[PDB]
Amino acid sequence: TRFASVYAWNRKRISNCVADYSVLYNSASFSTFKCYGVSPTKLNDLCFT
């Protein structure tokens, strides 16, 4: 619905779920995407903490 302001941002914790990002192909269209310390093609075989 609504987002926050730059000078006072937000933080949320995620846990105990399975990450399948193929569900975003239908609607979302992103103009920027960059990852540091990992490779985009290796994101389907790892587990995150």
């Binding site: 992103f30 103009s31 490779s39 985009p40 093609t41």
Partner: protein
């Protein structure tokens, strides 16, 4: 051994034409090798399509 390929895609999906990328265009439609040798060219054609 020169060759040329041609097709039409959306606006913000031109960042996926490069080795080592993920998305709906680099997964099901068109993929590039890892040891590539060539050039990539694109331009805007809003007035003709």
């Amino acid at each position: 051994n020169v060759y040329a390929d041609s097709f039409v895609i959306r606006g913000d999906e031109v960042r996926q034409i490069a080795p080592g990328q993920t998305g709906k265009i680099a997964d099901y439609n068109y993929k590039l090798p890892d040891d590539f040798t060539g050039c990539v060219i694109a331009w805007n054609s809003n007035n003709l399509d």
